[PDB]
Amino acid sequence: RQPPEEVDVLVVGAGFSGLYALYRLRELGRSVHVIETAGDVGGVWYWNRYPGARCDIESIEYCYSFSEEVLQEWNWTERYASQPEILRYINFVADKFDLRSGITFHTTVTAAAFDEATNTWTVDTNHGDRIRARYLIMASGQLSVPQLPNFPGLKDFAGNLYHTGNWPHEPVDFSGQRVGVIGTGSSGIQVSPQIAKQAAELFVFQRTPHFAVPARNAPLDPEFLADLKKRYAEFREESRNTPGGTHRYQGPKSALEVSDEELVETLERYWQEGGPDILAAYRDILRDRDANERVAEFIRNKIRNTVRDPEVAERLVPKGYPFGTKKLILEIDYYEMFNRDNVHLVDTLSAPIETITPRGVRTSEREYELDSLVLATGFDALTGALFKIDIRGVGNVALKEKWAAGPRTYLGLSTAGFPNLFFIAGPGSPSALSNMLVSIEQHVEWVTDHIAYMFKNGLTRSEAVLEKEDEWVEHVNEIADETLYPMTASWYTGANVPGKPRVFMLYVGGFHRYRQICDEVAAKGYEGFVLT
Ligand SMILES: Cc1cc2nc3c(=O)[nH]c(=O)nc-3n(C[C@H](O)[C@H](O)[C@H](O)COP(=O)(O)OP(=O)(O)OC[C@H]3O[C@@H](n4cnc5c(N)ncnc54)[C@H](O)[C@@H]3O)c2cc1C
Ligand SMILES: NC(=O)c1ccc[n+]([C@@H]2O[C@H](COP(=O)([O-])OP(=O)(O)OC[C@H]3O[C@@H](n4cnc5c(N)ncnc54)[C@H](OP(=O)(O)O)[C@@H]3O)[C@@H](O)[C@H]2O)c1
């Protein structure tokens, strides 16, 4: 499917963000096309096919609300949609509104330059395509460029090498093999208990132990669902007016103010129920390092109470960083896994990896023989995908350069000096600190209403104001700084990628507030933008 030479709005990416952009611009009467590297729709859920892949936000929440038809017809099956089912949903949504005729697949965008002469962007691909668009929507994701560490012997490994984020399309057989996994972020924790069932040995290469809590996944009762459907927009609307974009109860109490007996009884109740909801058990879990510690420790005794070898258990216990400052992971049978004879924890904090060999992984302590090695080493996050593209603004300024000391944006949506360009659900915004559907819907709607507003008013150049951008970056940092978020090396902060600026990259005031700010801005004629 050839891309058009000329288009009102060009969209990069056909995951959730891109598809909505496409749908909406068409609804608004604008011409619009999508360029996507993948072979089909899906984005993260197309790429991440490792066995176990599964959302951490509940199925009833992690979905589109923009269409009534879709809420009424689609039927989710479990509390947490596995990867194949979310893919199925996205294909369902693709068909329904005939989105594929808007999309060139197998094509990567490689450069994009703004031409002040004509207020347009000109966009280039590895297929040689060149597109002229008035507006450029980058919907190219938050976690979309796989981060494989440059472990010294990587290219010499004689076995099979994987990355969870670029997973093969046919199912991989690990039966009888010695398998290692590096990384115990949630990919690692999700993929490992699956490989453990097939492998003769599983070696789990852990560095910083992350906090995970049980998911308590269950079947979803068709009755619950049917009741839900009657009141569905009302439900999403409730979700939309929360810090997190989902139905978390926001605990009024401070975790220091309660007694021991009430704390344990509270948290036990969260632990039986499962889910990320513990995160907001007490209003100060992310604000005060002592409040934090009272919750963390409770989790830590859980780990020590689930793992039968008390030495391995201690190795598994999260240390060194505040609870919740790394993405809090939902585990299904990850800890019980280590009770199996064929599962082994390699603590690379205490024995670091020296090199990959052709037979396996060498630490300072021993060499581990492996047929396969799986990299759950995460993603060059938030900026990665933009950075792989040579984006050029007014004065021929590289985006890569303007952003070399960290992302600089006004509301995350735009960056001054690069008019007519927008970033869906990324730095300087709520992004992954919330149910991403909610964050993605608001950004698609806000941006595309914006474009329609430029067209209804016969305008052609929309650009953020330098002072307002600076005032936004300062604000993001200032408020991040009253949380424990900047205290740890997480991908939120860039520190997972050696050399990458460590700045906490996201808006932490919560979805709801960020939307209001965005509505106040839009209502005033898009204050902090200069439209001509
Ligand atoms: C394994 C995993 C699970 C997730 N689970 C959750 C969850 O629990 N809760 C939640 O809220 N969200 C979750 N996320 C976050 C996730 O990023 C969002 O939920 C959402 O799927 C991102 O959608 P998107 O359209 O914004 O970006 P993506 O789905 O990443 O789509 C971006 C697309 O753009 C394409 N692209 C990038 N560069 C180019 C290029 N130059 N040329 C052409 N195409 C390009 C990519 O191929 C990709 O398909 C998860 C992320 C991962 C990695
Ligand atoms: N169920 C879900 O919702 C889900 C699933 C997957 C991903 N995601 C999203 O995408 C993010 C990515 O998570 P992820 O599982 O892909 O990975 P991640 O959270 O980035 O963690 C990567 C893991 O690899 C380790 N690591 C990185 N570089 C290393 C090196 N050079 N040597 C040894 N270990 C190294 C890290 O150890 P250290 O932490 O100590 O550096 C960490 O264990 C998640 O936090 C979440 O936002 C969500």
From Swiss-Prot:
GO terms for molecular function: flavin adenine dinucleotide binding; N,N-dimethylaniline monooxygenase activity; NADP binding; phenylacetone monooxygenase activity. Gene3D superfamilies: FAD/NAD(P)-binding domain. Keywords: FAD, Flavoprotein, Monooxygenase, NADP, Oxidoreductase. Optimum pH is 8.0. FAD binds at S17, E36, V44, W45, Y46, W47, D56, Y62, V109, Q142, M436. PANTHER family: L-ORNITHINE N(5)-MONOOXYGENASE-RELATED. This is Phenylacetone monooxygenase. It comes from Thermobifida fusca (strain YX). The gene is pamO.
